[PDB]
Amino acid sequence: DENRCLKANAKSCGECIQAGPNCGWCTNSTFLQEGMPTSARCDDLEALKKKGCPPDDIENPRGSKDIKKNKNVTNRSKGTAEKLKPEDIHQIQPQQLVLRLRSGEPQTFTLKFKRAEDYPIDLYYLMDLSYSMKDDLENVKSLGTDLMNEMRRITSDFRIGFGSFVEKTVMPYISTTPAKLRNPCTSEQNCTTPFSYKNVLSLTNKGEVFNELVGKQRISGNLDSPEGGFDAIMQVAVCGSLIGWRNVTRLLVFSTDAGFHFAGDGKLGGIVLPNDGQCHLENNMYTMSHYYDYPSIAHLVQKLSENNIQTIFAVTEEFQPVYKELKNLIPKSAVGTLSANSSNVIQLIIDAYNSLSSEVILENGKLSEGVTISYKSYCKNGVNGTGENGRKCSNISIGDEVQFEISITSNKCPKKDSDSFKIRPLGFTEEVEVILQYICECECQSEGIPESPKCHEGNGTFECGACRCNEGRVGRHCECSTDEVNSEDMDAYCRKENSSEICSNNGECVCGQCVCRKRDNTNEIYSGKFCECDNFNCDRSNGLICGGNGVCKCRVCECNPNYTGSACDCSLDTSTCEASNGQICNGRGICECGVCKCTDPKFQGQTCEMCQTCLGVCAEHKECVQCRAFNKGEKCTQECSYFNITKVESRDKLVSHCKEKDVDDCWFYFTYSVNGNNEVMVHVVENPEC
Amino acid sequence: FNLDAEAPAVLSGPPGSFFGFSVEFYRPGTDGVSVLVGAPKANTSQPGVLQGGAVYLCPWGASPTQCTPIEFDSKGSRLLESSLSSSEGEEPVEYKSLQWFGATVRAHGSSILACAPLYSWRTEKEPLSDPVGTCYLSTDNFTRILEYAPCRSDFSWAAGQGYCQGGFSAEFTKTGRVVLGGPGSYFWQGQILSATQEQIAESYYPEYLINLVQGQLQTRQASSIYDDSYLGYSVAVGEFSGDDTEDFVAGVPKGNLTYGYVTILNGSDIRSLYNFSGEQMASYFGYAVAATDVNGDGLDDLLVGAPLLMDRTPDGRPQEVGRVYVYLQHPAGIEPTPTLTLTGHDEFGRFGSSLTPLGDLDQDGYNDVAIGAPFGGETQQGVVFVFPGGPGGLGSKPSQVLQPLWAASHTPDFFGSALRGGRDLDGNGYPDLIVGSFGVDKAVVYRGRPIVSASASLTIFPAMFNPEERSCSLEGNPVACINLSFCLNASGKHVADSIGFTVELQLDWQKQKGGVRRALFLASRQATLTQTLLIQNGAREDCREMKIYLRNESEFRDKLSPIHIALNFSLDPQAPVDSHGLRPALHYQSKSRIEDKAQILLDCGEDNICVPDLQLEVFGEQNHVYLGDKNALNLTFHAQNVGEGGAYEAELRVTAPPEAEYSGLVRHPGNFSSLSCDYFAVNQSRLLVCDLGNPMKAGASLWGGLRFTVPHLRDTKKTIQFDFQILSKNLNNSQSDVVSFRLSVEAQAQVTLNGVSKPEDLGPAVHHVYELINQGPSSISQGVLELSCPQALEGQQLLYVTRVTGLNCTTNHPINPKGLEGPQILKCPEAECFRLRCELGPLHQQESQSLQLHFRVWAKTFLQREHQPFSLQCEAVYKALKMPYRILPRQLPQKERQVATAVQW
Numbered sequence A: 001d002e003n004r005c006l007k008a009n010a011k012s013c014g015e016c017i018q019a020g021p022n023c024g025w026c027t028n029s030t031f032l033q034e035g036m037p038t039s040a041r042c043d044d045l046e047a048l049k050k051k052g053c054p055p056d057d058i059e060n061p062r063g064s065k066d067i068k069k070n071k072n073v074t075n076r077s078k079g080t081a082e083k084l085k086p087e088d089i090h091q092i093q094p095q096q097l098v099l100r101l102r103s104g105e106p107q108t109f110t111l112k113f114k115r116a117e118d119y120p121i122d123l124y125y126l127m128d129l130s131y132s133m134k135d136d137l138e139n140v141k142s143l144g145t146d147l148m149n150e151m152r153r154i155t156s157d158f159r160i161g162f163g164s165f166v167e168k169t170v171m172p173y174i175s176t177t178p179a180k181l182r183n184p185c186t187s188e189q190n191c192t193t194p195f196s197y198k199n200v201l202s203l204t205n206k207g208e209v210f211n212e213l214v215g216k217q218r219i220s221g222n223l224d225s226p227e228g229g230f231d232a233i234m235q236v237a238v239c240g241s242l243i244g245w246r247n248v249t250r251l252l253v254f255s256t257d258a259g260f261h262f263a264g265d266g267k268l269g270g271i272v273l274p275n276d277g278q279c280h281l282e283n284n285m286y287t288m289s290h291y292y293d294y295p296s297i298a299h300l301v302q303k304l305s306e307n308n309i310q311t312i313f314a315v316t317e318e319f320q321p322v323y324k325e326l327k328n329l330i331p332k333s334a335v336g337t338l339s340a341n342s343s344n345v346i347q348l349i350i351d352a353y354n355s356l357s358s359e360v361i362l363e364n365g366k367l368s369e370g371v372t373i374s375y376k377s378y379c380k381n382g383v384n385g386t387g388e389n390g391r392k393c394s395n396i397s398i399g400d401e402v403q404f405e406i407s408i409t410s411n412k413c414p415k416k417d418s419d420s421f422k423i424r425p426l427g428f429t430e431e432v433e434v435i436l437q438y439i440c441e442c443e444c445q446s447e448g449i450p451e452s453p454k455c456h457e458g459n460g461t462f463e464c465g466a467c468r469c470n471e472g473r474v475g476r477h478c479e480c481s482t483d484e485v486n487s488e489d490m491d492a493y494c495r496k497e498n499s500s501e502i503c504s505n506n507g508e509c510v511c512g513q514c515v516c517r518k519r520d521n522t523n524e525i526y527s528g529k530f531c532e533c534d535n536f537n538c539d540r541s542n543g544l545i546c547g548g549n550g551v552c553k554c555r556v557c558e559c560n561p562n563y564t565g566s567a568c569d570c571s572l573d574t575s576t577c578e579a580s581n582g583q584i585c586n587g588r589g590i591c592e593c594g595v596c597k598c599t600d601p602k603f604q605g606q607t608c609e610m611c612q613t614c615l616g617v618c619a620e621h622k623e624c625v626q627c628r629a630f631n632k633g634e635k636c637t638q639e640c641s642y643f644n645i646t647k648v649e650s651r652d653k654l655v656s657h658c659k660e661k662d663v664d665d666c667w668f669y670f671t672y673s674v675n676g677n678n679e680v681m682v683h684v685v686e687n688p689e690c
Numbered sequence B: 001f002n003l004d005a006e007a008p009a010v011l012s013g014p015p016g017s018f019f020g021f022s023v024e025f026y027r028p029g030t031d032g033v034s035v036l037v038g039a040p041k042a043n044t045s046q047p048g049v050l051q052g053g054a055v056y057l058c059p060w061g062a063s064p065t066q067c068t069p070i071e072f073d074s075k076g077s078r079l080l081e082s083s084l085s086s087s088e089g090e091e092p093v094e095y096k097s098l099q100w101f102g103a104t105v106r107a108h109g110s111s112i113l114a115c116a117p118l119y120s121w122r123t124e125k126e127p128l129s130d131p132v133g134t135c136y137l138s139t140d141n142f143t144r145i146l147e148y149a150p151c152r153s154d155f156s157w158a159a160g161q162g163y164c165q166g167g168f169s170a171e172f173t174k175t176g177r178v179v180l181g182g183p184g185s186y187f188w189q190g191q192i193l194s195a196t197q198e199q200i201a202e203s204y205y206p207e208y209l210i211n212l213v214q215g216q217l218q219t220r221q222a223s224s225i226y227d228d229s230y231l232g233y234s235v236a237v238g239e240f241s242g243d244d245t246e247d248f249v250a251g252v253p254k255g256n257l258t259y260g261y262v263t264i265l266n267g268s269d270i271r272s273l274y275n276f277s278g279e280q281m282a283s284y285f286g287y288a289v290a291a292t293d294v295n296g297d298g299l300d301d302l303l304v305g306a307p308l309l310m311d312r313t314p315d316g317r318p319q320e321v322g323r324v325y326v327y328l329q330h331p332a333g334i335e336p337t338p339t340l341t342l343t344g345h346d347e348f349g350r351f352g353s354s355l356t357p358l359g360d361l362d363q364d365g366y367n368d369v370a371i372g373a374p375f376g377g378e379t380q381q382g383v384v385f386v387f388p389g390g391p392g393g394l395g396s397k398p399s400q401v402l403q404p405l406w407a408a409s410h411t412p413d414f415f416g417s418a419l420r421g422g423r424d425l426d427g428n429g430y431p432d433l434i435v436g437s438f439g440v441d442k443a444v445v446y447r448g449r450p451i452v453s454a455s456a457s458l459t460i461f462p463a464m465f466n467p468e469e470r471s472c473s474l475e476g477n478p479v480a481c482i483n484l485s486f487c488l489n490a491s492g493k494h495v496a497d498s499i500g501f502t503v504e505l506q507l508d509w510q511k512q513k514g515g516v517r518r519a520l521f522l523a524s525r526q527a528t529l530t531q532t533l534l535i536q537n538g539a540r541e542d543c544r545e546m547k548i549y550l551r552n553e554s555e556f557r558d559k560l561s562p563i564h565i566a567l568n569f570s571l572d573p574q575a576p577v578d579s580h581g582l583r584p585a586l587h588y589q590s591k592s593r594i595e596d597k598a599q600i601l602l603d604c605g606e607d608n609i610c611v612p613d614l615q616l617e618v619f620g621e622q623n624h625v626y627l628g629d630k631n632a633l634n635l636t637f638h639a640q641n642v643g644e645g646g647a648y649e650a651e652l653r654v655t656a657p658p659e660a661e662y663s664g665l666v667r668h669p670g671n672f673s674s675l676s677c678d679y680f681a682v683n684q685s686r687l688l689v690c691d692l693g694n695p696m697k698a699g700a701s702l703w704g705g706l707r708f709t710v711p712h713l714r715d716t717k718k719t720i721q722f723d724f725q726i727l728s729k730n731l732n733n734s735q736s737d738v739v740s741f742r743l744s745v746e747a748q749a750q751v752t753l754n755g756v757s758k759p760e761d762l763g764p765a766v767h768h769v770y771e772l773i774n775q776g777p778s779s780i781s782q783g784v785l786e787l788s789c790p791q792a793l794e795g796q797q798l799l800y801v802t803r804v805t806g807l808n809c810t811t812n813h814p815i816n817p818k819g820l821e822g823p824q825i826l827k828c829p830e831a832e833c834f835r836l837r838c839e840l841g842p843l844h845q846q847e848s849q850s851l852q853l854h855f856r857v858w859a860k861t862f863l864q865r866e867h868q869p870f871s872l873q874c875e876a877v878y879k880a881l882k883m884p885y886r887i888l889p890r891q892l893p894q895k896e897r898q899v900a901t902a903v904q905w
């Protein structure tokens, strides 16, 4: 009966459920002895049945999962009603769900996700304005018109926006000398003053307008090889409204031919202030660059993820490797090959977008201590993902449904109030909120009225039929009140026999009951009414208490399902008893404690394999011709399992053959064939001789 | 916990001057000790200079109300008139504006170096803007001012060391050697430059602004791939070589393609001895560096700070946890993989930004190290973590946490920006720690206090107490009192001769929870006694003797439970003010609580005296030990007590050999059939404890029969030793005389010999089978068996031996002639015998040796005697040459056997 609930010594019903879900608390506790405490009330559901009495009053609540709404996503995108508006169509089926958490019970739900066939795309193009990328600018002017046409096939709603990020103005990054300031390049060449962050234009439905703005843009340059693209990218995401971000998937195109400075690179610059991730742009110009130091890569990931802006990197083969390492850090982003003059920029964007769309990942909200989440996913072509692979599926085409079972476990009842949290994948405005209302109350406790006069005018909580004595009260009635001013005649209830020590000399006696004295080596308080039982007074099988695996109960070793005996180390395993022949303990004997006890006379050995005195097999095993066939005598096929061979006049004269007399007094020739170790082959001559 | 964070000294600097950026100790001890604080954006009086920056020195005073900035530069930036005459007016050759002087402050002895990297110089011949970087060297109590421009050179633009920012990170060696590392030279590759104080002063020339020194040592030039490595970002001095020359520790933040590595380079060799590579990508490994011995082996260990490390929590959300690294140097080799690491929970902690050696703060024999978290804390004020020194490794958990007393403001405090430690400001024998807070423009220094270790030990000699007789009787009522006395000792360094302490004694503490207090002090008539005791550092422990009396009333129903005596003390809260000003402290390891239990003497005697005289006599049955046999040894011991009662928990423990194992115990006493016996594995030798009884009974004699199994143990190499003794919990004469019984172990063998004849192609088959079985448990090698019949296996021979098997055997005559097939007494001696001597080496317990002899009868020979009864007889003797045992003092098994076979017609 050893379990956490019993070990917990549950004071009230609420503790039986908290200690173990299987354990149930009987309010009636009729079976429970008055002397026995509240712990004895709590018992396993299977264990309660062991008693043979079932209590209706006992409460065993089980956690359940419910759903507030069950909306249906449009299927096949057919008809005017389907995809009527962005808010109107929801990819996620269940908007939110409600479940009940029970300690020791897992809770899993099914989430149905299907890709929407039609979804608008917004494309913000961040292009390095460095002198090396000049050639790229001329192509980017005629690119916008080509882009719009290609993206129209991909999506019936495409918006093009141009962004120009160079580097933060500082004495070290860019030449302080005023002559260079006017133009970063040589005097003969024409280069515009460097600007760390500038907006050429916002997102528009017409690509032609974009073309005109690109042409006005003038080539710029920076002294350092790495450019401050990171600062420009961060500003775009945080502002949002400025870039005119919409629910339509946003491709964060980022094209540069050089490296990127990150985190506290301002140090040489002398700026010790980190980026605040806030919008300070004025007239499409960010002038807080010499105020805030370049933001860290982790900080940039937090912003892009928060605004769900897909990040696509279009960099040259020289810096390709560096950007690939960064890719793992920033999610919902891709890396493609960039031409010297951005000739294949349009081809990259198209390919990059397809890869990002196929990969879908689920992210949940911050969870309090004692709360965990498990992900189980379903994929096409028989591919199953677990752990990290379980959370995100891949190779998802338009109109393809993928489901993700999520398991949430809540224990310790930390918060009584309901916890509401929201879970959503990157690039998807639609989210899923799982709300949980923890129940830690007791139905009987609600029914139970405080200060009940039955239990000595409420001295002990009398909820339902269960009476739990309060501090200073021991028993069913708790009419003791411990020590009093007028000394009483000890406690008659404490000792069955007055002559014997109060509570069998095992503890302190009060309120007409017995609380056993604490023991450091074993469970402090012993079991029993008179505390006469003990948890460390049992026998040891071999230097280990109760076989080393048994549980001591009232100074009595109880063995496990695999053990039997006072020692309790005696296993029920008969594997050691078995021999090569295949009969337990050879021919005869009883397998007890893993050591065969030979029964048949003059049988010695571990499996009693040595019986020299024992009569010869041919003589003793004469039942093979008289039990299988010509049935007569005793019994049967348990011992003589050897196969009979139909051999006539076999030349095997001495293995050693044997001869006997039959019913008609006819000689019978037979033998048992053994060549190596133990072998079994019977050769009884069919042809009879009289 | 030694540092006095509660009242840290505060240094005041002008707002916006970035006061507290860099703080270091210069010329500590001797005449006077002063604190230097860097003021880089600090407004200077220099003409034409804006936000030049300055270093402020504050003389140690009970109150730091006075702080004077060091006058490093008393003149304006130099302008050359010759070029100015040719040109229109005058143009600044160099700009002192935004110099950020004081960004680094290093002081060795009387020499102080203040360098601002942002400071630049315009080329005289043509105008070029580059961060060359400057410094100001002060020595001999500011006797001679020297200006050193190492990064300054003819080489100009990205190609030259014109952006070097020399002095960004500067460290002084133990010899006062200057080490300036700049991260902007050679297209921002970085360059570490070092020169001695004497060489730099001699090389420096006032007339020529740009000068060169012969024998100057700097870092080597690197390729375009090595560019933007930011070499020298953080410099430190550490010794791993063990040579007189001191190695330079300088981590790269943007090195190894933005991964960041730390390289240790010897100034004389101008090369890197060993390099450390960061695991976390964009780790920024080398942002903060430090060299000190943190494990007490006398070998410098290298610490590196990576606050940009972004770790992943159980939820999976990404936070800038960061990691602090430190590696304990070994003589055999230097391990790259970090032995220990530090992880910061604080999201955006930025921890490990500044690291400062603190010497041995706890005087534990291990040096400690402070780490700075600029954006640490709930209010993001900033925090500094002090980790305790450990010989195996520095403890992961911080020893103490320091939080700024001042209320948080909207402007980031940036605490832990600069950390200085390992130098004793007041020479109290405990290293101090000064923290830089440039955001609040203040400077905070934390003083320490000495730790004193004490020990409380309460011992009661007259614990035995009986209420029948009271030694002390009061006028009101009689109540016997047990003499109670507790001794306390105190020792330490930098503590007063007399130290105030607070002793507190509790009687029946486990009965103080609403229970009737059994024992009370006789003098104050109360259970508790708190007291003050002045204890000298070198004085012997003083034990104050007190008398505690137990009550004699029928009020308490239960008195079975023993009285509990608890002594608990602590340093007095109102400690007397000391000249040093540091309050005394008590070490956590020392225990200031001693717990004792007193049990009333029950039925001791008329005089209440308990004296047991246990007697023990033991013997062993079946004493002979057969090696290799399942020997059973029953221990027979008669235990008796001719002494008085009070020997509580009497128990006989028989220490077993490795060989012997316990099965059970049977006694003769009527009350208990089987005495309880529990295993005691903790005892070095297996010991079985059987309780004779709960309360000792005078004249209680108990005969105990213990059966012990003997699992094989041939490694004993002598007679097994079993020790029998009686143990008691009594204060005096607790144990009985020890009884040691030696059990002789002598292996014995027993080989049986049994022979029978099957009788008892011409000639009926005759089978003679001789079998030897080693019934005895001792297997014997080299068993020799001599088999012999009365025929030579010839033709005139009546019998024809065919073969013999089951043991290897050699026959003098051919065993196989050609191929595998009144009464006359035919016996070996009568005719030609055919003796065959066999030999069997491999033998085991219960092994059966059986030799089958099958000599057929020669028909022609038999026909020689037509009507004669023949009786064939074959004999066999055997022996055993030796047995495989360490000792064999017994008889070696031997025997003989005959076999007969009659023939009739």
Ligand SMILES: *[C@@H]1O[C@H](CO)[C@@H](O[C@@H]2O[C@H](CO)[C@@H](O[C@@H]3O[C@H](CO[C@H]4O[C@H](CO)[C@@H](O)[C@H](O)[C@@H]4O[C@@H]4O[C@H](CO)[C@@H](O)[C@H](O)[C@H]4NC(C)=O)[C@@H](O)[C@H](O[C@H]4O[C@H](CO)[C@@H](O)[C@H](O)[C@@H]4O)[C@@H]3O)[C@H](O)[C@H]2NC(C)=O)[C@H](O)[C@H]1NC(C)=O
Binding pocket: B219, B220, B221, B222, B223, B226, B263, B272, B273, B274, B275
């Ligand atoms: C811990 O980290 C440290 C920092 O990363 C490591 O230091 C680095 O270690 C690597 C590997 O040893 C070095 O790589 C080698 O550097 C050599 C430097 O030689 C050039 O530079 C020096 C100093 O300025 C100069 O004296 C030389 O003469 C040479 O400069 C040449 O100058 C001429 C002048 O006209 C110019 O034309 C040349 O262009 C220029 N050098 C060239 C060839 O471009 C190189 O020589 C080494 O090159 C190897 O391969 C060459 C081609 O086959 C061959 O010719 C060379 O003989 C040689 O085999 C090689 O590149 C890093 O420089 C060094 N970085 C530093 C010091 O910061 C440290 O090593 C590491 N721990 C270890 C393992 O020790």
Ligand SMILES: *[C@@H]1O[C@H](CO)[C@@H](O[C@@H]2O[C@H](CO)[C@@H](O[C@@H]3O[C@H](CO)[C@@H](O)[C@H](O)[C@@H]3O)[C@H](O)[C@H]2NC(C)=O)[C@H](O)[C@H]1NC(C)=O
Binding pocket: A028, A030, A465
């Ligand atoms: C609380 O428990 C008591 C005692 O069980 C209930 O009183 C009634 O007692 C009788 C006799 O014990 C119960 O009969 C039982 O029936 C089962 C059937 O398997 C049998 O195995 C038992 O030996 C016994 O004969 C009876 O069930 C029970 N009353 C009812 C209505 O079942 C009492 O009702 C319980 N409720 C409360 C709040 O007291």
Ligand SMILES: *[C@@H]1O[C@H](CO)[C@@H](O[C@@H]2O[C@H](CO)[C@@H](O[C@@H]3O[C@H](CO)[C@@H](O)[C@H](O)[C@@H]3O)[C@H](O)[C@H]2NC(C)=O)[C@H](O)[C@H]1NC(C)=O
Binding pocket: A377, A378, A382, A383, A384
């Ligand atoms: C892990 O992968 C295995 C496949 O290797 C999944 O087992 C599959 O279980 C599904 C049902 O959950 C079976 O799909 C059924 O297919 C039949 C047609 O064959 C269709 O008529 C049913 O409506 C249903 O879709 C599938 O046969 C079965 N595959 C096999 C052979 O194992 C398993 O479900 C995956 N892990 C999960 C998500 O539990």
Ligand SMILES: *[C@@H]1O[C@H](CO)[C@@H](O[C@@H]2O[C@H](CO)[C@@H](O[C@@H]3O[C@H](CO)[C@@H](O)[C@H](O)[C@@H]3O)[C@H](O)[C@H]2NC(C)=O)[C@H](O)[C@H]1NC(C)=O
Binding pocket: A451, A456, A457, A458, A459, A481
């Ligand atoms: C819960 O316990 C409290 C005590 O902690 C009860 O209050 C008082 O308890 C005393 C002792 O049980 C009562 O005195 C009793 O009087 C009867 C005769 O009426 C006598 O036979 C008993 O031996 C005892 O002396 C006392 O009446 C009672 N009330 C007072 C005045 O405080 C309390 O009644 C119990 N119920 C609750 C929760 O109210």
Ligand SMILES: *[C@@H]1O[C@H](CO)[C@@H](O[C@@H]2O[C@H](CO)[C@@H](O[C@@H]3O[C@H](CO)[C@@H](O)[C@H](O)[C@@H]3O)[C@H](O)[C@H]2NC(C)=O)[C@H](O)[C@H]1NC(C)=O
Binding pocket: B256, B259, B277, B278, B279
């Ligand atoms: C810059 O850091 C990178 C790691 O971020 C280094 O790449 C690493 O290169 C080594 C091979 O040289 C790979 O194995 C290492 O080998 C050494 C022995 O040579 C061994 O002691 C180390 O434990 C390690 O296994 C290593 O796998 C590879 N990076 C990875 C993926 O771990 C690179 O070597 C560093 N800079 C250079 C090129 O020196």
Ligand SMILES: *[C@@H]1O[C@H](CO)[C@@H](O[C@@H]2O[C@H](CO)[C@@H](O)[C@H](O)[C@H]2NC(C)=O)[C@H](O)[C@H]1NC(C)=O
Binding pocket: A188, A189, A190
């Ligand atoms: C660089 O820019 C200047 C303008 O700032 C160019 O001057 C222009 O030249 C064109 C003819 O090519 C004239 O039509 C414009 O009127 C001029 N503008 C001004 C403001 O003078 C100059 O030609 C450019 N130089 C180059 C291309 O190197």
Ligand SMILES: *[C@@H]1O[C@H](CO)[C@@H](O[C@@H]2O[C@H](CO)[C@@H](O)[C@H](O)[C@H]2NC(C)=O)[C@H](O)[C@H]1NC(C)=O
Binding pocket: A245, A246, A247, A429
């Ligand atoms: C994208 O969808 C959301 C769905 O609510 C639209 O509503 C915005 O939701 C965000 C959630 O943080 C709020 O911060 C905005 O204030 C909401 N905007 C308004 C005015 O409804 C959102 O408008 C859509 N995208 C747009 C048009 O910005």
Ligand SMILES: *[C@@H]1O[C@H](CO)[C@@H](O[C@@H]2O[C@H](CO)[C@@H](O)[C@H](O)[C@H]2NC(C)=O)[C@H](O)[C@H]1NC(C)=O
Binding pocket: A135, A138, A139, A340, A341, A343
């Ligand atoms: C962008 O770069 C490509 C590089 O191939 C240019 O393509 C070449 O254009 C020249 C004419 O200017 C042809 O002679 C070459 O044959 C083309 N490439 C090859 C490999 O054949 C392209 O013209 C450039 N576009 C612009 C105008 O920037």
Ligand SMILES: *[C@@H]1O[C@H](CO)[C@@H](O[C@@H]2O[C@H](CO)[C@@H](O)[C@H](O)[C@H]2NC(C)=O)[C@H](O)[C@H]1NC(C)=O
Binding pocket: A381, A395, A397
């Ligand atoms: C990703 O899915 C696509 C289908 O949408 C896979 O491409 C085809 O898959 C089918 C079914 O397995 C095969 O019969 C075809 O031969 C595949 N190729 C064609 C012609 O589309 C694709 O293989 C999947 N991912 C990969 C490449 O492993």
Ligand SMILES: *[C@@H]1O[C@H](CO)[C@@H](O[C@@H]2O[C@H](CO)[C@@H](O)[C@H](O)[C@H]2NC(C)=O)[C@H](O)[C@H]1NC(C)=O
Binding pocket: B241, B243, B245, B266, B267, B268, B269, B270
């Ligand atoms: C540290 O720097 C020195 C340069 O002084 C390195 O060169 C050694 O110089 C000493 C003379 O001072 C020679 O005796 C050694 O032979 C030189 N090095 C070797 C081992 O060849 C020296 O190598 C560096 N430290 C060491 C010895 O590791």
Ligand SMILES: *[C@@H]1O[C@H](CO)[C@@H](O[C@@H]2O[C@H](CO)[C@@H](O)[C@H](O)[C@H]2NC(C)=O)[C@H](O)[C@H]1NC(C)=O
Binding pocket: B455, B488, B489, B490, B539, B540, B541
């Ligand atoms: C207080 O503490 C010490 C710690 O052991 C006690 O033991 C003494 O230790 C010192 C160490 O130098 C020895 O010199 C002494 O001989 C030890 N005690 C004795 C018996 O002299 C010490 O006894 C305690 N206080 C006292 C009684 O001096």
Ligand SMILES: *[C@@H]1O[C@H](CO)[C@@H](O[C@@H]2O[C@H](CO)[C@@H](O)[C@H](O)[C@H]2NC(C)=O)[C@H](O)[C@H]1NC(C)=O
Binding pocket: B504, B568, B569
């Ligand atoms: C020993 O006695 C002292 C008496 O002061 C106890 O110290 C007090 O402990 C309580 C409970 O922890 C605190 O609330 C008080 O603040 C302590 N004293 C004061 C007022 O300063 C001490 O707890 C006792 N021994 C133990 C177990 O610590």
Ligand SMILES: *[C@@H]1O[C@H](CO)[C@@H](O)[C@H](O)[C@H]1NC(C)=O
Binding pocket: B471, B472, B481, B483, B545
């Ligand atoms: C202990 O106290 C008793 C009085 O109860 C006294 O007679 C005796 O001398 C004391 N012994 C000491 C102080 O050693």
Ligand SMILES: [Ca+2]
Binding pocket: A131, A132, A133, A134, A135, A136, A257, A340, A341
């Ligand atoms: Ca280009």
Ligand SMILES: [Ca+2]
Binding pocket: A167, A173, A222, A223, A224, A225, A226, A227, A228
């Ligand atoms: Ca740049």
Ligand SMILES: [Ca+2]
Binding pocket: B239, B240, B241, B242, B243, B244, B245, B246, B247, B266
């Ligand atoms: Ca050295």
